[PDB]
C-alpha cells in the first residue's frame with residue numbers, strides 16, 4: 001500500500017527518473033500531476049482513492065520497465081492517457097495502485113508518403129489533429145469531438161467522431177500498434193498476433209496492457225470542408241418536430257454529411273445546437289440541407305467553409321485551431337455523469353418529447369444525438385470489437401453536469417439522469433440494452449477482483465456489460481485477454497476477464 005525503496009530503486013535503476021510519491025499537499029508535484037488529467041471533477045475530492053505514486057515514463061522502454069517494476073510489487077497498475085474516463089478508471093482503484101501517466105508520450109510522427117501516423121498513446125486527439133494540420137491540409141483523422149481526449153483510451157475503446165460516418169471509428173483505422181504486456185515485452189502487430197491486435201482496437205482500455213503507440217491510417221479530407229454550429233432557441237413542440245425529423249435526416253444522409261445535435265432546456269426555453277459537417281463545399285451542403293431539412297431554418301451565413309482542422313476545432317467550440325494542441329484546456333470544469341444508448345428502431349416523437357420535458361425540468365442536464373449509418377453500416381460487426389454497425393441508427397447520450405457550487409445537490413442530478421435512462425428504455429435497444437465501452441458505465445455493474453467468489457465467476461458476471469459493449473465479440477475478447485494477460489495484471493471494475 002506504500003511506495004517504497006524497492007519500487008523507487010527499481011525505477012531509478014532502469015532510468016525512469018520522472019516519478020513522484022503520494023503527497024496531500026496542494027503545492028506538491030504529485031498532487032498537481034494527479035489533478036492535471038482528472039477530466040471529471042467527480043473524482044477529485046480527498047475521499048477518492050489516490051495513487052501511491054505517479055510515474056511519467058518518457059519513452060517506450062521507460063514504460064516497459066515501469067510496468068516491470070510495478071509488477072515486482074503488490075500494486076494495481078493504472079494507465080492514464082487523457083484521463084477522460086467517465087468513471088475515473090484511469091486514476092482510481094479499490095486496491096492500492098500506481099499511476100502511470102502517459103502525458104510525456106505525446107509525440108506524433110506523420111508519414112506523408114504512406115499517409116499514416118505513429119501516435120504515442122499519451123497524445124490527445126487535439127495534439128494529433130494539430131500535428132496533422134501542421135503536416136497536411138489534405139489529410140485528417142476521426143476519433144471523437146473532444147480534443148482533450150487521449151488517443152490511448154479513446155482508440156482503445158474505438159473512437160466515434162465527426163467523420164466516422166465516412167471512415168468509421170478511430171480503431172477501425174489502426175494499421176499497427178505498439179503494446180507493452182504485463183511482462184514489459186514490447187510487441188507490434190506482428191509480435192502480438194491478430195487476436196490481440198484485433199482486441200486492442202475497441203476492446204477497451206486498461207485491459208490488454210499499455211498501448212505505447214498507435215499506427216493509424218490518415219484520412220483524406222478536401223482542402224475545404226463545410227460546417228455549421230447553430231443554436232436554435234425554440235419551444236418543446238418545434239424542438240420535438242426538429243429532433244424527430246433529425247433522426248431520419250441524419251441517419252439517411254450520405255457519408256459526406258454529419259448532422260449531430262446537442263440539446264437542452266429550461267422550462268419553456270428549449271435550446272438545440274446543430275453541429276453540421278460536410279465533406280465538401282458550402283453550396284452543396286446548404287443545398288442538401290435546404291432540400292432535406294429546411295425546417296432547421298439554416299441560412300447562408302450559418303454555413304462556413306474552412307480546413308478540416310479548423311472545422312473540428314470550430315465544432316468542438318475551440319477559439320482557434322492551435323487550441324487543439326493544448327491538452328490542459330479544460331472542455332468543461334464541471335463534474336459530470338453520462339449514460340448512453342444505441343438505437344436499432346426509430347424513436348417515436350414521444351421519446352424526444354419526454355426527453356425534452358425532462359431536460360426542461362433539469363437545466364443542468366443535456367443530451368447529445370449522433371447518427372450512424374454511412375460507413376458505420378458497412379464495416380462488419382466483428383472487424384473490430386465494436387459490434388454496433390449495420391442496423392444501428394443513433395447514439396443517444398444523456399449527460400448531467402454541475403459545478404462545485406451545486407455539488408451538494410449531486411444525487412438529485414444523478415437521480416434525474418437515472419429517470420431519463422429509465423424513460424428511454426422502451427424506445428432503445430433491448431436484450432441486451434446496448435452500450436459503448438468508451439462510454440463506460442458502472443451502473444451496469446462491476447467486478448471486485450479481490451472477491452474470489454466473484455472472480456471464479458468473473459466471465460458470466462461480466463457478461464452483463466460485456467454483451468452490452470461488444471455483443472458477439474465478447475468471446476473472442478476473452479480469448480485474446482487470456483492470450484495477452486492470463487494473470488489479469490491489467491484489470492478494472494469492467495475489464496475483460498481471462499479464461500479460467
Ligand SMILES: *[C@@H]1O[C@H](CO)[C@@H](O[C@@H]2O[C@H](CO)[C@@H](O[C@@H]3O[C@H](CO)[C@@H](O)[C@H](O[C@H]4O[C@H](CO)[C@@H](O)[C@H](O)[C@@H]4O[C@H]4O[C@H](CO)[C@@H](O)[C@H](O)[C@@H]4O[C@H]4O[C@H](CO)[C@@H](O)[C@H](O)[C@@H]4O)[C@@H]3O)[C@H](O)[C@H]2NC(C)=O)[C@H](O)[C@H]1NC(C)=O
Pocket residue numbers: 017018019036056103104
Ligand atoms: C516529469 O514530467 C512532467 C510533465 O511533462 C515535467 O513537467 C514539465 O517540465 C517541463 C520542462 O522540462 C515544462 O516545460 C515548460 O513549460 C512551460 C509552460 O509552463 C513553458 O513556458 C516552457 O517553455 C520554455 O522552455 C522550452 C524549453 O525547455 C522552450 O521550448 C520554450 O520556448 C520556452 O522557453 C522560452 O520561453 C521562456 C518563457 O516562457 C523563457 O524563459 C525562455 O528564455 C525562452 O524564451 C526564448 O524562446 C522563446 C521561444 O522561441 C522566445 O520567444 C524568447 O524570445 C526567447 O528566445 C517549457 O516548455 C512543463 O511545463 C512541465 N509540465 C507540467 C505539466 O508541469 C517534469 O519536468 C518531469 N519531471 C522530471 C523529474 O523530469
Ligand SMILES: *Cc1cc2c(nc3c(=O)[nH]c(=O)nc-3n2C[C@H](O)[C@H](O)[C@H](O)COP(=O)(O)OP(=O)(O)OC[C@H]2O[C@@H](n3cnc4c(N)ncnc43)[C@H](O)[C@@H]2O)c(*)c1C
Pocket residue numbers: 039078079080081082083084085086088089090091102121122143144145146148149150151152153154156157158159160161204205206207209210211212331438439492
Ligand atoms: C471526457 C470526454 C470523453 C469523450 C468525449 N467525446 C467522445 C466522442 O466524441 N466520441 C467517443 O467515442 N468518445 C468520446 N469520449 C469518451 C472517450 O472516448 C473515452 O473516455 C476514452 O476512453 C478516454 O480516453 P483517455 O482520454 O485516454 O482517458 P483515460 O482515462 O486515460 O483512458 C480511459 C481508459 O483507457 C485506459 N488507458 C488509458 N491510456 C491507455 C493506454 N495508453 N494503453 C492502454 N489503456 C489505456 C485507462 O486505464 C482507462 O481505463 C468528450 C469528452 C469531453
Ligand SMILES: COc1ccc(C[C@H]2c3cc(O)c(OC)cc3CCN2C)cc1O
Pocket residue numbers: 145260261262275331332333334335336338368369370397399401
Ligand atoms: C456531437 O458530438 C458530441 C459533442 C458533445 C458531446 C458531450 C460531451 C460532454 C460535454 C460536456 O460539456 C460535459 O460537461 C462536463 C460532459 C460531456 C461528456 C459527454 N461528452 C461526450 C458529445 C458528443 O457526441
Ligand SMILES: *[C@@H]1O[C@H](CO)[C@@H](O)[C@H](O)[C@H]1NC(C)=O
Pocket residue numbers: 451452453454
Ligand atoms: C463476494 O461476492 C459475493 C456475491 O456478491 C458475496 O456474497 C460475498 O460476500 C463476497 N465476498 C467477499 C469476500 O466480499
Ligand SMILES: [Cl-]
Pocket residue numbers: 141142143144145160161162163312
Ligand atoms: Cl473526430
